[PDB]
Amino acid sequence: ERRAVYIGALFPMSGGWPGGQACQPAVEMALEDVNSRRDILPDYELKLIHHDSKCDPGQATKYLYELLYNDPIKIILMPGCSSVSTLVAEAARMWNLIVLSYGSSSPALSNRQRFPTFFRTHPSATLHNPTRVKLFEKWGWKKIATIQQTTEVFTSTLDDLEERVKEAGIEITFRQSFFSDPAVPVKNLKRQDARIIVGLFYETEARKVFCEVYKERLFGKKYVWFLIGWYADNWFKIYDPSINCTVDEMTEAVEGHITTEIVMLNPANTRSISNMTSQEFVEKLTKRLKRHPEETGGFQEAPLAYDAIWALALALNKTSRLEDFNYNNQTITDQIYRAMNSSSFEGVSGHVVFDASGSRMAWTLIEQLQGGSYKKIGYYDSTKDDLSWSKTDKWIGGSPPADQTLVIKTFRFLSQKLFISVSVLSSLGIVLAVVCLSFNIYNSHVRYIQNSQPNLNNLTAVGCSLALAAVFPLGLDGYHIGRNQFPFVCQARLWLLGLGFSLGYGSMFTKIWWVHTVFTKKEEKKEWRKTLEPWKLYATVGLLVGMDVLTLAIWQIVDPLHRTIETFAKEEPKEDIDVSILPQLEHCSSRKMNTWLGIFYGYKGLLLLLGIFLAYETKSVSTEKINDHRAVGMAIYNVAVLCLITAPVTMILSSQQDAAFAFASLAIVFSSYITLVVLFVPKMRRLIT
Amino acid sequence: SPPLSIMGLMPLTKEVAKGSIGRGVLPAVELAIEQIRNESLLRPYFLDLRLYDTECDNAKGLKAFYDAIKYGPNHLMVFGGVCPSVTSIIAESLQGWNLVQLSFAATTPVLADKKKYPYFFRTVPSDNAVNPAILKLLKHYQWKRVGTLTQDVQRFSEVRNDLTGVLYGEDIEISDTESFSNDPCTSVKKLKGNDVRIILGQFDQNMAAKVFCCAYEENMYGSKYQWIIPGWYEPSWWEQVHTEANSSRCLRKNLLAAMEGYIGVDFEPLSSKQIKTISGKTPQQYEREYNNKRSGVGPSKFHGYAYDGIWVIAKTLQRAMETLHASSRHQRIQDFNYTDHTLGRIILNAMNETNFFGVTGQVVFRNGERMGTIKFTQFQDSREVKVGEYNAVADTLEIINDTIRFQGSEPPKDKTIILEQLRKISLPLYSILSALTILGMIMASAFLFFNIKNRNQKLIKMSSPYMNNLIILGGMLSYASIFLFGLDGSFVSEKTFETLCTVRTWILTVGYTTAFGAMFAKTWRVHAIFKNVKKKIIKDQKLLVIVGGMLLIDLCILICWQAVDPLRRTVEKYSMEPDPAGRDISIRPLLEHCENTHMTIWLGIVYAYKGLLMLFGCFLAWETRNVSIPALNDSKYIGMSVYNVGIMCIIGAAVSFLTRDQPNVQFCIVALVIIFCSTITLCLVFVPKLITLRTN
Ligand SMILES: *[C@@H]1O[C@H](CO)[C@@H](O[C@@H]2O[C@H](CO)[C@@H](O[C@@H]3O[C@H](CO)[C@@H](O)[C@H](O)[C@@H]3O)[C@H](O)[C@H]2NC(C)=O)[C@H](O)[C@H]1NC(C)=O
Ligand SMILES: *[C@@H]1O[C@H](CO)[C@@H](O[C@@H]2O[C@H](CO)[C@@H](O)[C@H](O)[C@H]2NC(C)=O)[C@H](O)[C@H]1NC(C)=O
Ligand SMILES: *[C@@H]1O[C@H](CO)[C@@H](O[C@@H]2O[C@H](CO)[C@@H](O)[C@H](O)[C@H]2NC(C)=O)[C@H](O)[C@H]1NC(C)=O
Ligand SMILES: CSc1nc(NC2CCCC2)c([N+](=O)[O-])c(NC2CCCC2)n1
Numbered sequence A: 001e002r003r004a005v006y007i008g009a010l011f012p013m014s015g016g017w018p019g020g021q022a023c024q025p026a027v028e029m030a031l032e033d034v035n036s037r038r039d040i041l042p043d044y045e046l047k048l049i050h051h052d053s054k055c056d057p058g059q060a061t062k063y064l065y066e067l068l069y070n071d072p073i074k075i076i077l078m079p080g081c082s083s084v085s086t087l088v089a090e091a092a093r094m095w096n097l098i099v100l101s102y103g104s105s106s107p108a109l110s111n112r113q114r115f116p117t118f119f120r121t122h123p124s125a126t127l128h129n130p131t132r133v134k135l136f137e138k139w140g141w142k143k144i145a146t147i148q149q150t151t152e153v154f155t156s157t158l159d160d161l162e163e164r165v166k167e168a169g170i171e172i173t174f175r176q177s178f179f180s181d182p183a184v185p186v187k188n189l190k191r192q193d194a195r196i197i198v199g200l201f202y203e204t205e206a207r208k209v210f211c212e213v214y215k216e217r218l219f220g221k222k223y224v225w226f227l228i229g230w231y232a233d234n235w236f237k238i239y240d241p242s243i244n245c246t247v248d249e250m251t252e253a254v255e256g257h258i259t260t261e262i263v264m265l266n267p268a269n270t271r272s273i274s275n276m277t278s279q280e281f282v283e284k285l286t287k288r289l290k291r292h293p294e295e296t297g298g299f300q301e302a303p304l305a306y307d308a309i310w311a312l313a314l315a316l317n318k319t320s321r322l323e324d325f326n327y328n329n330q331t332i333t334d335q336i337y338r339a340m341n342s343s344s345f346e347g348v349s350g351h352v353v354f355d356a357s358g359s360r361m362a363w364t365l366i367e368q369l370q371g372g373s374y375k376k377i378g379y380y381d382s383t384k385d386d387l388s389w390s391k392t393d394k395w396i397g398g399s400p401p402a403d404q405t406l407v408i409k410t411f412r413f414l415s416q417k418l419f420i421s422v423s424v425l426s427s428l429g430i431v432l433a434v435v436c437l438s439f440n441i442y443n444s445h446v447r448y449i450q451n452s453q454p455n456l457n458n459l460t461a462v463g464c465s466l467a468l469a470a471v472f473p474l475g476l477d478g479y480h481i482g483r484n485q486f487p488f489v490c491q492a493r494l495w496l497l498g499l500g501f502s503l504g505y506g507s508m509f510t511k512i513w514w515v516h517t518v519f520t521k522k523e524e525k526k527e528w529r530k531t532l533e534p535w536k537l538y539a540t541v542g543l544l545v546g547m548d549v550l551t552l553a554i555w556q557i558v559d560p561l562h563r564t565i566e567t568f569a570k571e572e573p574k575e576d577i578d579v580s581i582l583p584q585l586e587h588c589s590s591r592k593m594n595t596w597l598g599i600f601y602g603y604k605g606l607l608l609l610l611g612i613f614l615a616y617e618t619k620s621v622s623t624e625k626i627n628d629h630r631a632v633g634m635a636i637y638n639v640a641v642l643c644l645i646t647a648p649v650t651m652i653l654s655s656q657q658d659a660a661f662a663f664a665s666l667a668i669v670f671s672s673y674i675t676l677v678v679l680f681v682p683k684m685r686r687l688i689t
Numbered sequence B: 001s002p003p004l005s006i007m008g009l010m011p012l013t014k015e016v017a018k019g020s021i022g023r024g025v026l027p028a029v030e031l032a033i034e035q036i037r038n039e040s041l042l043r044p045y046f047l048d049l050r051l052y053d054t055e056c057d058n059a060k061g062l063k064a065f066y067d068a069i070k071y072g073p074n075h076l077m078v079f080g081g082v083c084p085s086v087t088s089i090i091a092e093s094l095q096g097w098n099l100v101q102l103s104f105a106a107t108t109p110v111l112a113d114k115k116k117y118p119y120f121f122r123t124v125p126s127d128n129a130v131n132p133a134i135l136k137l138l139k140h141y142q143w144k145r146v147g148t149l150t151q152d153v154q155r156f157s158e159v160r161n162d163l164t165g166v167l168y169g170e171d172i173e174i175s176d177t178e179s180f181s182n183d184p185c186t187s188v189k190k191l192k193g194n195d196v197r198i199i200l201g202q203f204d205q206n207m208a209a210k211v212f213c214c215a216y217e218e219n220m221y222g223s224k225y226q227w228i229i230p231g232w233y234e235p236s237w238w239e240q241v242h243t244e245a246n247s248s249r250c251l252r253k254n255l256l257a258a259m260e261g262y263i264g265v266d267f268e269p270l271s272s273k274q275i276k277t278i279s280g281k282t283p284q285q286y287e288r289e290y291n292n293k294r295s296g297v298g299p300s301k302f303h304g305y306a307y308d309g310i311w312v313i314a315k316t317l318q319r320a321m322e323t324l325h326a327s328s329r330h331q332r333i334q335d336f337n338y339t340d341h342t343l344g345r346i347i348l349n350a351m352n353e354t355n356f357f358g359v360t361g362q363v364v365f366r367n368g369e370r371m372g373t374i375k376f377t378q379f380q381d382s383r384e385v386k387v388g389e390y391n392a393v394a395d396t397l398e399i400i401n402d403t404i405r406f407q408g409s410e411p412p413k414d415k416t417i418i419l420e421q422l423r424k425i426s427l428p429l430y431s432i433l434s435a436l437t438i439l440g441m442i443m444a445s446a447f448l449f450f451n452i453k454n455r456n457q458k459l460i461k462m463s464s465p466y467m468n469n470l471i472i473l474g475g476m477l478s479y480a481s482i483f484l485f486g487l488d489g490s491f492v493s494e495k496t497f498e499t500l501c502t503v504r505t506w507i508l509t510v511g512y513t514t515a516f517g518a519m520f521a522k523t524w525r526v527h528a529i530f531k532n533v534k535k536k537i538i539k540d541q542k543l544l545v546i547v548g549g550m551l552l553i554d555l556c557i558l559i560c561w562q563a564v565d566p567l568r569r570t571v572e573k574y575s576m577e578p579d580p581a582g583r584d585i586s587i588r589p590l591l592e593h594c595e596n597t598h599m600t601i602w603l604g605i606v607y608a609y610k611g612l613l614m615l616f617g618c619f620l621a622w623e624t625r626n627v628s629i630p631a632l633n634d635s636k637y638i639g640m641s642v643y644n645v646g647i648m649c650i651i652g653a654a655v656s657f658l659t660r661d662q663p664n665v666q667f668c669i670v671a672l673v674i675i676f677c678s679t680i681t682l683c684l685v686f687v688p689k690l691i692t693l694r695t696n
């Protein structure tokens, strides 16, 4: 007859993690196998003393006092969830016992200084952090926020995550915590408006936080939730009297969150240490149960409990005098510890290394919730960074959301309506200018031959034509050309502006100068300032325009105009898209303009006022001339008043969408039209007459 | 008499860090038992106290608890527990044996949830008795904008979660909420950028040095801020934060001047007033007996809060034992195998009510917690001083004046002041333009003098005396418009602004109409006299009648608008608030207007009718240009005038309609547009006849 020994066990069957409903039969499938094979235990049987606990520390403490002070002497203890496992492991040092857990996943249970006689088969919970960080780099985010329940099982995991997220640039922004009532953290998370949320709490707190996240509209299109994976399959479709929400007010609340879990079963087809494959165990266990395998709590953690007996059986067979074990002798406990430390084999979950910092499994599993059903997106591997994606995720609009951003927008203007009208109005006149020039050339001048020489009139005609042909460099912008050759666009503008005004204005001003100075002066004029030849007017025109050439060439080679961006106020509504518009407008300017433009405009304006004074002081005296001085006086008056009114306006208005272009274009076109028609209607009149 | 015994757990040895606390409170309770034993309120029984050891160890504590349960007599209550872990471990599992716990040193805030700690009472104000008191302090200084800065642990998050529920209902709002874990002054910059001025902090002793070092670099001190920091730290906690100089980025003398005058909130060890309490001595008497009772053991700060727990237990036992039943109530006190639920209920419900004046005031409970007393301290001259008090059952706040002070000369403010300001016209500009308009008025007076003086001298064209007088009166009537434009809200006081804006258009349009009509009537008369001919006067006042009809119809055009359709002020603002010249009062600009909801209309009709008048004048100039009449008629001056007026008006209207955000340039534009046009018109009209009459 074989002697019998006893072990102690706590099986949680309710509460934050109901596991015993799938864990109590599995051990009952193992013990009947370990007490029936004469190879592994020749003269001993193992018996179990189980107690329900709900893994609450009060009932756990009561049942622990009940267990430790009874007549059958125990050998090992087997706790349940982590809140009981840590308490048992801390307290078992005064009785010289051995704690062997099968469901605890606390990262803080690796510190061997506080827990000397503790062993576990469940892997560490730091295996989720190499996955989630990867999922933060594929979709490109940098600002997240966490919310946790203040138990050390989640506190150590949050510490490990915030330690391992620093090596990828991502940084935490907002932290929250709660002990029993999560209303205030959810309120603060809504008022602070975070977008990426990571949750760390038990199963029973998930409903008591989601019924309070539904009442503040913290879901929908621009919020992402990361959760845990070992929950039940239908954890929101159950009746809970401690909340006020209804099932259709939560099914729309939990739509679109991301869950990650760890696999716990060898997917291959091998032969184990117990002559059983990796799916016959699952089939036999599902036959042994009574309810459906989809809703039985803790179904994934069954092979761990099936291996936790076999490992101790092999260790105790390696030791193989187990009838006088007291509660105050050390010399047996260190022997059993050294025999257990050097054990390794293959079981149902794989190879049991049994002494590391965890991490004897490799893979993970990622899932999403769609329409009230779970779907597996894709697996992951930790070492070789393998990520076997499958493209089975449906966001809103075919694209995942992001954080808040800001777009940059340059201005344009009416590139068709206001611009093509100016272009056709310029093209209507640029050809009339040259055909009137041709008419001045080829027509047999008789009255004009009696009048002044028409070369200084061809100068005026070419000048107003070249002044009119300067709207095309003014309307173009970054819509077409303004990327690289913008300085040549400014060059075209400035060269055309500097030429086309100066040539025609000088060719009129010298005629009005002579027609003033010839008539009534007898002091000193005979062959003065020039010769008689048309080279007189040509040379004074050349001096006047050469001045302008020096003015352009000094600050075109000393201080050119490259480019300048101006940025003002922002936050357009942007048509209900989560984006913020920033408008700017670019234009061609140097570092200094209000000095050069001012001095050049004043130097030209004094000459313009002198010209209109010299044009007014002679009105109705004429000899040997047909119609020149009256016509050039009227034209110079019109050009003078139009330029003096228009030019100081375009410097003030910087909003050049429809003001600064329109004023300059209207002034140029009207001045050119009036000058041409008034100067060269009477030649055609007296030629047809 | 048969005895009844109660369990007690506290550190005793010297090899632990919290043993002296027990040795600080063991003589005091050693007095209180004697105070019972000489009177014996529990007359047929006798009180007994058993003592055990915890040593602030989970394993040793649970072993001692289990050994006291297994090898001990029948116990009734458990009294004690000072270490913040073994106390919670014991208290979470009291329903299994039906016992009641009374603590005197567990001040952790998590023990207030009575949904899983039903059998736990304490006689010491916890860390949740700070949240009401702070609120009352705000009602002594009127601060309604606060920001919180907390660590992230359990005990430092329970207070921040309770603060929201405390400060709900009143008119106080939490502006910011930040939280750090290891680097405190990454969120201090966020608090600086949000511009808060009252700070409530919750952090331990280690992070306080880092917070006060990082707050000195960002310049968040002086007479502009106020810090509320917990004050249960040990004395001289700053002189030993750095053994070596390994606390750089902040020096000593640039830290003592950084943490100046913060407010520390704690509880109070004893009572300030004096009556005869339930024992029979004054609190000063009891303090004397405790101070000469111990021999050489140093004093503690829990020796007062433990002397009252024994009397609480004694009064509870006396008020629960002597119920209506006698025989069963004296028989059921030795069969207590820690399973009797009725005895546990009859102990708990009698323990719920207690009310007497002990040594720390009244001893009253609320949902398990205790109503106590709160003490305020301030950091002054590198030292801490007690400055106030806050009762809890009477809900009053007493401030000991002649002690508190501030760095400035008044309490600081919660936020800066927002000041709205109007944008006015430059007074030199107004003076210059008014002087120029006055000079133009004097020139117009001279011109009218000339027109009336030689009206019948040398036959100067013998045409339009009255019409020229009407033209120059129209110009004089138009100058009052530019007299009238440059108003300001400070000079109208909202008294006549709703009327001047709608009579400005009246006077301007009347002047315009009468000027152009009296201009065109002359040329109409010259065209009338040279047709349908022997000539004479054709009309003495019929032309005056028809220009009056034109002015009347275009004035009724205006007047038939102000019967249902208004046009009044809509003052707008531009919140781009800068600083003043060195000051801190944030000012915003706002400017007034005189607009309507139909500003794009009521302009095209009047502009089109003025264009029709211009076209009629063009017809008159056409009819008079082909005459080549002597100086009595004029067809060139009128054309020059209309060409110089129309272009300038059609430019100036569109220019002045655009520049709305620059109120000091559109006045200068409209003034020049009016004055140049009127001067050019008067000069083209009068002086050609004037030079001819002067030549004669
Ligand atoms: C546990 O291990 C045993 C042996 O390794 C497996 O035993 C099964 O045994 C039967 C009975 O012999 C085999 O069937 C037939 O055996 C006769 C013997 O005369 C032979 O002539 C036939 O060709 C046939 O092999 C059966 O093959 C064998 N099973 C397997 C998978 O080979 C038993 O299956 C193992 N348990 C489990 C759950 O797999
Ligand atoms: C359990 O331990 C026993 C020893 O107590 C092992 O039995 C031995 O098996 C080998 C096989 O070659 C024999 O040579 C020995 O004589 C056996 N020992 C005894 C005492 O009979 C047994 O193999 C172990 N079971 C395992 C490792 O599964
Ligand atoms: C604990 O005792 C207090 C003090 O009596 C109870 O508070 C009131 O008690 C009186 C009678 O003792 C009742 O009439 C009142 O209704 C109680 N409430 C209030 C708000 O005055 C308190 O109810 C007791 N606790 C329990 C659980 O009964
Ligand atoms: C040189 S002939 C002359 N033509 C004038 N207009 C013409 C009609 C169309 C543009 C030309 C004016 N005008 O419109 O004022 C004018 N004014 C003088 C009198 C005061 C000094 C200037 N002289």
Ligand SMILES: *[C@@H]1O[C@H](CO)[C@@H](O)[C@H](O)[C@H]1NC(C)=O
Binding pocket: A328, A329, A330, A331, A332
């Ligand atoms: C512990 O057990 C060993 C072997 O059984 C024995 O030698 C030793 O004396 C024991 N220690 C005790 C009884 O304290």
Ligand SMILES: *[C@@H]1O[C@H](CO)[C@@H](O)[C@H](O)[C@H]1NC(C)=O
Binding pocket: A341, A342, A355
């Ligand atoms: C357990 O075995 C490993 C394997 O070498 C060894 O490194 C470790 O020190 C052992 N544990 C103890 C407590 O000696």
Ligand SMILES: *[C@@H]1O[C@H](CO)[C@@H](O)[C@H](O)[C@H]1NC(C)=O
Binding pocket: B034, B038
């Ligand atoms: C008890 O009280 C009596 C008088 O009431 C007094 O004489 C005696 O000294 C007291 N004894 C103690 C131990 O307090």
Ligand SMILES: *[C@@H]1O[C@H](CO)[C@@H](O)[C@H](O)[C@H]1NC(C)=O
Binding pocket: B243, B244, B245, B246, B247
């Ligand atoms: C020097 O500073 C570090 C922290 O920067 C501290 O941990 C260490 O104890 C200091 N050393 C001494 C001797 O003070």
Ligand SMILES: *[C@@H]1O[C@H](CO)[C@@H](O)[C@H](O)[C@H]1NC(C)=O
Binding pocket: B335, B336, B337
């Ligand atoms: C338990 O209580 C009963 C009376 O209810 C008593 O007779 C018995 O002695 C108690 N048990 C112990 C171990 O004292």
Ligand SMILES: *[C@@H]1O[C@H](CO)[C@@H](O)[C@H](O)[C@H]1NC(C)=O
Binding pocket: B400, B401, B402
């Ligand atoms: C505190 O100030 C008030 C008035 O400011 C004064 O009446 C009062 O006496 C002061 N307190 C003390 C203790 O002097």
Ligand SMILES: CP(=O)(O)CCCN
Binding pocket: A017, A081, A082, A083, A103, A104, A105, A106, A153, A230, A301
């Ligand atoms: C949160 P816990 O580790 O106690 C239970 C984990 C079960 N896989």
